[PDB]
Design a protein around this ligand. Sequence first.
Ligand code: HEM
Ligand code: HEM
Ligand code: HEM
Ligand code: HEM
Ligand SMILES: Clc1ccc(CO[C@H](Cn2ccnc2)c2ccc(Cl)cc2Cl)cc1
Ligand SMILES: Clc1ccc(CO[C@H](Cn2ccnc2)c2ccc(Cl)cc2Cl)cc1
Ligand SMILES: Clc1ccc(CO[C@H](Cn2ccnc2)c2ccc(Cl)cc2Cl)cc1
Ligand SMILES: Clc1ccc(CO[C@H](Cn2ccnc2)c2ccc(Cl)cc2Cl)cc1
Ligand SMILES: [F-]
Ligand SMILES: [F-]
Ligand SMILES: [F-]
Ligand SMILES: [F-]
Ligand SMILES: [F-]
Ligand SMILES: [F-]
Ligand SMILES: [F-]
Ligand SMILES: [F-]
Ligand SMILES: [F-]
Ligand SMILES: [F-]
Ligand SMILES: [F-]
Ligand SMILES: [F-]
Ligand SMILES: [F-]
Ligand SMILES: [F-]
Ligand SMILES: [F-]
Ligand SMILES: [F-]
Ligand SMILES: [F-]
Ligand SMILES: [F-]
Ligand SMILES: [F-]
Ligand SMILES: [F-]
Ligand SMILES: [F-]
Ligand SMILES: [F-]
Ligand SMILES: [F-]
Ligand SMILES: [F-]
Ligand SMILES: [F-]
Ligand SMILES: [F-]
Ligand SMILES: [F-]
Ligand SMILES: [F-]
Lengths: 399, 391, 391, 399
Amino acid sequence: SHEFQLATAETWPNPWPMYRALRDHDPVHHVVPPQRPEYDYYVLSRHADVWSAARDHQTFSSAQGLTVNYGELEMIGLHDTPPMVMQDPPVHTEFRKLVSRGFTPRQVETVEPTVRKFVVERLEKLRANGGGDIVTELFKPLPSMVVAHYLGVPEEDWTQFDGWTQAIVAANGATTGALDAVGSMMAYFTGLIERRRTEPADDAISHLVAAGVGADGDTAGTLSILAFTFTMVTGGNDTVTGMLGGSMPLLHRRPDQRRLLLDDPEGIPDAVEELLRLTSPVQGLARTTTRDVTIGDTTIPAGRRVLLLYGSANRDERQYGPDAAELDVTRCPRNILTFSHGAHHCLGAAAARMQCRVALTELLARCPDFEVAESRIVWSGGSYVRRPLSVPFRVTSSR
Amino acid sequence: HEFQLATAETWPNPWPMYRALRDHDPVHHVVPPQRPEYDYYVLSRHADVWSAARDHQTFSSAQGLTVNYGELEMIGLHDTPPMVMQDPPVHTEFRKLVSRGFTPRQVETVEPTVRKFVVERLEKLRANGGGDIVTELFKPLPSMVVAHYLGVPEEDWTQFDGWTQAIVATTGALDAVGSMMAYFTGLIERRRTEPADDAISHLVAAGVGADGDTAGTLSILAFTFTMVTGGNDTVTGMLGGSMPLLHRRPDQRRLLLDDPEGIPDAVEELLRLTSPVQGLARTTTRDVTIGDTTIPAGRRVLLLYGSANRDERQYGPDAAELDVTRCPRNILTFSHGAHHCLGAAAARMQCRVALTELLARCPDFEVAESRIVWSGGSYVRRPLSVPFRVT
Amino acid sequence: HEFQLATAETWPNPWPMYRALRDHDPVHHVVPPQRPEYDYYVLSRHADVWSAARDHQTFSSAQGLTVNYGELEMIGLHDTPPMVMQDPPVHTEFRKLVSRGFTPRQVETVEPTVRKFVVERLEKLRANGGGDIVTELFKPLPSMVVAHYLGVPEEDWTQFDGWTQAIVATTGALDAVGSMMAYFTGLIERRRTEPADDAISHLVAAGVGADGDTAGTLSILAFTFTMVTGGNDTVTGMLGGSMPLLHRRPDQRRLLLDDPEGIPDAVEELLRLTSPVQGLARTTTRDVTIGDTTIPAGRRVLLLYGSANRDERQYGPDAAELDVTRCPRNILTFSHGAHHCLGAAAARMQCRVALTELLARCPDFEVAESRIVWSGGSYVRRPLSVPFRVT
Amino acid sequence: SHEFQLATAETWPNPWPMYRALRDHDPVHHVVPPQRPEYDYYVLSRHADVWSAARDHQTFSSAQGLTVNYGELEMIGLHDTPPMVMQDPPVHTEFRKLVSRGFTPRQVETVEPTVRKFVVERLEKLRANGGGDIVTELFKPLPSMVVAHYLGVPEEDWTQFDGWTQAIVAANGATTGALDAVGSMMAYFTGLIERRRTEPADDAISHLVAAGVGADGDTAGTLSILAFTFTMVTGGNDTVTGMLGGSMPLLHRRPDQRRLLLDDPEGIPDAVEELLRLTSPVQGLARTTTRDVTIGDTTIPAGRRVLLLYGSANRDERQYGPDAAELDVTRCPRNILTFSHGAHHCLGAAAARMQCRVALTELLARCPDFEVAESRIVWSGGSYVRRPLSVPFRVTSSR
Ligand code: HEM
Ligand code: HEM
Ligand code: HEM
Ligand code: HEM
Ligand SMILES: Clc1ccc(CO[C@H](Cn2ccnc2)c2ccc(Cl)cc2Cl)cc1
Ligand SMILES: Clc1ccc(CO[C@H](Cn2ccnc2)c2ccc(Cl)cc2Cl)cc1
Ligand SMILES: Clc1ccc(CO[C@H](Cn2ccnc2)c2ccc(Cl)cc2Cl)cc1
Ligand SMILES: Clc1ccc(CO[C@H](Cn2ccnc2)c2ccc(Cl)cc2Cl)cc1
Ligand SMILES: [F-]
Ligand SMILES: [F-]
Ligand SMILES: [F-]
Ligand SMILES: [F-]
Ligand SMILES: [F-]
Ligand SMILES: [F-]
Ligand SMILES: [F-]
Ligand SMILES: [F-]
Ligand SMILES: [F-]
Ligand SMILES: [F-]
Ligand SMILES: [F-]
Ligand SMILES: [F-]
Ligand SMILES: [F-]
Ligand SMILES: [F-]
Ligand SMILES: [F-]
Ligand SMILES: [F-]
Ligand SMILES: [F-]
Ligand SMILES: [F-]
Ligand SMILES: [F-]
Ligand SMILES: [F-]
Ligand SMILES: [F-]
Ligand SMILES: [F-]
Ligand SMILES: [F-]
Ligand SMILES: [F-]
Ligand SMILES: [F-]
Ligand SMILES: [F-]
Ligand SMILES: [F-]
Ligand SMILES: [F-]
């Protein structure tokens, strides 16, 4: 297929061939914006290369940015960039230590029931109409509760909070309700932060406040806690949506794979893994070299940005065999990059996995013969996170 | 004595330490016993600092502006600007847009508004014999100008300054930040359909934040925050920092009293001696050699503007003292090069005004040096309290 | 349940967790939430652990033997051997010399001395109905043999064990370490002109420490320390660990009571089921692939000897239970390959003796499983207290 | 001159030409023991290369050993190796943090008087005999007091402690008094450690005990504190001796340089720096690569040991000019490697510097026209630390 090109809503449907293209012919692809040559960068597509890069945080930095956009830490450009910039060990270690305290196994169990309740409520509402938009009806609002949960947002506010969430996530002058939501969200948290100073819980934010972040005047601290929550509200929400929605077409395309999980629900957890591999909600993130580095026969100059195609890595035939491109709920894939590897390995991987499990389990139980109108599926914009905005669902069984 | 990052108790007199460095260790090496890897260098001579600032490709700003490699560690104590600028080409565009909010029309337009406040507050002080000139005037003063450049509508200036003064400060500032944050979100929204001439309007007009951006809208708020705090302290610093200087040299003030036509030139001298931004670091993007010393690539190098301005090698023997008639050239109070301060004009205007009115309405005033209280912070040197007395 | 490094409260029954791993996650990946970089793998199947241990060039020992990358951080809590062995070629020479202190003559020579103590203490216990068989016998017992291999003269064995028992334990052990340290320095000095057949004599005879070496003399002391502690706990572990097993399966004991000619074979079975050294890590020297999983170079990989020995894929369905008649082959209680235990013989002898005398003089004994107390430590599993009762 | 070859007492006199040889012709010299080829290693001699290597602790590890001896962390071989093995950041960071607490400026001031007292006592005793062995009479016992000081050894024990010190430092069956000293030293410290558990000072050791090292049973901890003290007693003692003694011939060879410091004692501190550069007590230490690394046109395989010739680096003409080999007390040398650079930059650099200053100052004041019988100077064994055992001194002025 075509050569590298950052993804758009139009290209998100089948980026797989471009990946194969790169993997089979330009493992270390050099991109040179024809107009702005000073912003050239590289793209890694082979599982092996992407894997090493992600892990070797010493050579491939994060604190410079996570996208191929050099103006990332400035003002112009942004739009498609994480709200917060992550540091590298040792600097990053304090943070990871503290925030991981709000990301324990109890955190998952404590909110799983809520997840299932909602999943079942919406699933049955859809069985009522014998169809609908499973993304709009379930996979979009679903993650918001988990994110609110991890952020330490009290139930009374859940209603209000989800409001703001949905206004912002919708961003991509309809986005005016967005600037508004952000402000609202903004003030809310400075409040919640205040509340936590003396009424701490065990949510990530409580552990940062309790640890002193944004304490006695420390403005920069408070600001970063905010940057964190907004990064969670935005990304933590639609990465899960991307997984759930993105899984629909994969399953639809193969009822035999669906049948396996039907006669034996035990395969679901493993299936979630295979689904995670193929969907790769976070298709790719970039790094900045901290010294001239040589991969294969290409030598990426220091200071250059390199995009790690996690999505291509999870589909690399070299790592997963000939059928890498196909769905195999029994595959039990090892070394997937869906959550990356190394210092920043996703803290909510078990939260996402739980959500996928509950969702897929309930779905397969109540809508054993669902169908997806692929052709009518809509993909969100952005070049890094691959999620669907709309997924025409329809249980070939009603009432 | 040996070099060391300043503190509120060491800010009263860093001058000797600077001389020491300029004279005996131009390219000073600091090696923290606890962390020899988190080592850095300190340039103190005017010629070097000047050349360093001008050479952005070699001395980058995109790594931080502090000598602390672990600055971005949420741990605590963040003596650092609420956000950091990139270097060209990246910075070029940003700077180009924001500079449209820093035009001559911009500075001129608010001057009258500023002079009025200065006079009102000065007279309020004469009506009391004295008072703390920093909290009473110098602190609130720079607040207005920031708002003016951020495009904050006048009616709000009262409510706004309300937060400003809480943030630049029992942490009710958290609330102040939330309020101000949300405030700006609306102002940005608004600016999408009412593009004035403020920096923010020019940014929003470019597409920043204008689209449920997030990140983009957050960087807008980071910038507004930098201005809100940095823009206050620096002016507060210079205006307050000038008090003891003018107090100590009555002969100088006399020159300005007999001939106020020399106040603009005095403003330069005062800026040279105050250097509110005593220093800011950079990070070598390659191994660079200065004199005998060679600084490895990726090393923080603190540019001591404050010292460079007092460098005898540049301003003569008396470089260390007040000479309102000096008319110093090439000062580094606003750095040099790609990051040269955009609010230099705005900064100068506030002092030309403030100083003129001070001298014109309180020709005879006294400052209790001994009772001045400096703020903390190793990079920006400003007084928290400067007891004033007109008589 | 999910995998996790053992603790004194989890040592009572790890068997289920192992099964789980062997059956569902042969090459288990552990990713610490606080430190995803300090991640590692856990091999639990006999075939893999066996192959891992045999392949030293790929799975090195010279990085540490714990899954904790920050093991050598003085911070605190050091669940790790008092020193670490290198891999061939380096290890080859060391092992060659030290192995001369682990000869057949060596094991045979002290057996009688050992059996006597066993009998004395066993009778002392019969004279009291019972007592704690670990503190009363199993703990002091392995002490003698170590001393014997370290070349500690018998008269001292009393004073020596004195320290041993203090160290293997209000930290009067610090003093015990100092005393023992100095003790060995003299013994080494001595050995320069009185080279016996102990391991130390063979080392000193080679030139180690013998020259105001330091380092060299300190490594001698590190080794003697490893032996002193490790060599005790492991045997203490196996002997004590066998108590509940023999207690639980009276039918088994009966087989040994009617025919004590089957005790040597029972010793193997008991070693297979106790695996005092439940596990020890290695560090991949290259990217290596096991099954679907690929472990990156420089990754700690915990070899679960304890699990490999209970692997049904190797010993059949009942692999999980006591069959003194089994005569298990290729157990991993003493690892395999370049680091295969040198004191395997010495270890086996102490149990052949201890067990025979136990069964011969207390055919009818009881162990209060419910009241056994395990020691801490995630790699060596031994009981601190095993209340004994003869009746 | 000849090709690389680890130093011996016989070769320590003038190793400078071998260095130049390497620098000018084999900057990345490959050494291959003819008999044990598996133990091949590399040697860096150019200031630039040695400097980068020392700093880049990520690539060039320390925790594997500090010498070119691969059996370093085992048993056979040792002899010429540090008693303790240093870790790499982050692991090493805790230690550095705690021990540096006992290495403050006060620590120097608090013991400087003692240094000067002793220096003057011995100097005058030598003026008495109008000569003697300045190493045996002063530069050998001198450092012991500072080391005892930093280790937190109470004055009453000073007598006893120095005894053991001298017995061990003498190591290189006369070394029998050594094995004895070590044992004595050994037990002493376990005691001192005990004492510190409740009677802590501000000496390095107190900070480790107070921090918990070797606490509630932690045997490994206690053992490492010991390894540290023995590393100080051995190395901390004779590196200073190497500097002081080694400086004698350098000064002797140039009375004009000595004259400068005579008419202006201010130059002494700077002189100490130039002396430090030329003496390089720690001529070199090795590192182990943690990945294939390429210097120039040579690519040192990972896992290989590399010797960083600090002594050659300080003499590199490229860094210090044409006269790099000569003494210039006004040179004011920048970037010297005498104390290394990076994570392990010597903690006692200011202590050594103080000693050199006091010594050199007193010497130049009381023995302005001393002489050294170079030909009769004796060098200690070992390939890493270059110190003299004997230095025939003689003030061409008596009484
Ligand atoms: C299927 C959904 C998800 C995917 C694919 C995903 C993916 C990722 C990836 C790849 C990273 C690291 C990016 C890099 O630097 O390469 C990351 C980090 C992280 N994720 Fe997720 N994530 C998901 C859901 C979540 C959720 C629901 C939460 C929160 C409840 C979460 C919390 C975080 C946090 C806090 C980190 C930062 C860890 C660090 O920097 O050490 N993620 N995620
Ligand atoms: C006493 C008065 C002030 C002083 C001494 C001061 C000093 C500085 C310095 C040293 C820099 C460059 C720092 C570096 O990169 O090393 C700077 C940049 C800047 N200042 Fe100020 N400043 C003052 C007042 C103001 C005010 C009131 C504003 C406007 C509201 C302002 C806006 C800025 C901006 C936006 C830049 C960044 C320019 C760029 O990055 O291209 N400054 N200032
Ligand atoms: C219950 C009895 C014992 C058990 C289960 C045991 C277990 C082990 C294991 C697992 C190893 C290899 C560890 C590895 O590298 O992964 C080992 C090595 C060794 N053991 Fe033991 N051991 C026991 C008793 C003893 C005794 C009493 C001595 C002798 C006094 C001894 C001396 C050693 C030595 C010196 C080695 C190292 C060999 C080498 O590195 O080449 N062991 N032991
Ligand atoms: C002229 C004399 C001395 C020289 C040339 C010297 C040299 C060195 C060097 C080169 C290192 C680091 C080696 C490497 O890894 O490359 C070192 C580390 C150190 N030195 Fe010295 N040293 C001297 C005197 C002392 C003294 C007197 C003390 C103690 C009072 C001392 C305490 C230490 C300590 C504790 C470190 C370890 C720091 C760390 O690992 O972070 N040194 N020394
Ligand atoms: Cl603290 C933190 C920082 C970064 C990331 C990861 O980057 C997030 C994805 N994400 C978010 C949550 N879980 C996954 C991201 C990528 C690309 C773009 Cl354009 C936007 C976003 Cl939000 C995760 C936590
Ligand atoms: Cl966009 C921008 C970024 C940085 C700077 C300059 O850095 C500011 C000073 N400042 C602020 C305004 N005018 C001057 C600063 C330095 C040190 C410390 Cl601790 C705090 C602050 Cl705020 C200027 C604009
Ligand atoms: Cl020279 C040598 C080095 C290591 C080992 C083996 O490692 C020992 C076990 N051990 C000791 C003796 N026989 C067995 C050990 C493991 C874990 C923990 Cl936490 C402590 C210890 Cl002590 C054996 C000789
Ligand atoms: Cl904690 C620590 C570890 C290592 C070193 C440094 O290595 C020391 C030199 N030294 C010692 C003190 N100051 C300098 C050394 C090198 C070579 C040889 Cl053969 C022996 C020794 Cl002792 C310094 C502290
Ligand atoms: F798009
Ligand atoms: F660029
Ligand atoms: F890898
Ligand atoms: F139901
Ligand atoms: F139904
Ligand atoms: F302060
Ligand atoms: F001065
Ligand atoms: F000069
Ligand atoms: F840090
Ligand atoms: F323009
Ligand atoms: F307006
Ligand atoms: F001038
Ligand atoms: F005016
Ligand atoms: F005063
Ligand atoms: F435990
Ligand atoms: F089981
Ligand atoms: F299987
Ligand atoms: F660590
Ligand atoms: F042999
Ligand atoms: F004997
Ligand atoms: F078998
Ligand atoms: F027997
Ligand atoms: F029981
Ligand atoms: F020698
Ligand atoms: F080797
Ligand atoms: F360098
Ligand atoms: F005298
Ligand atoms: F005299």
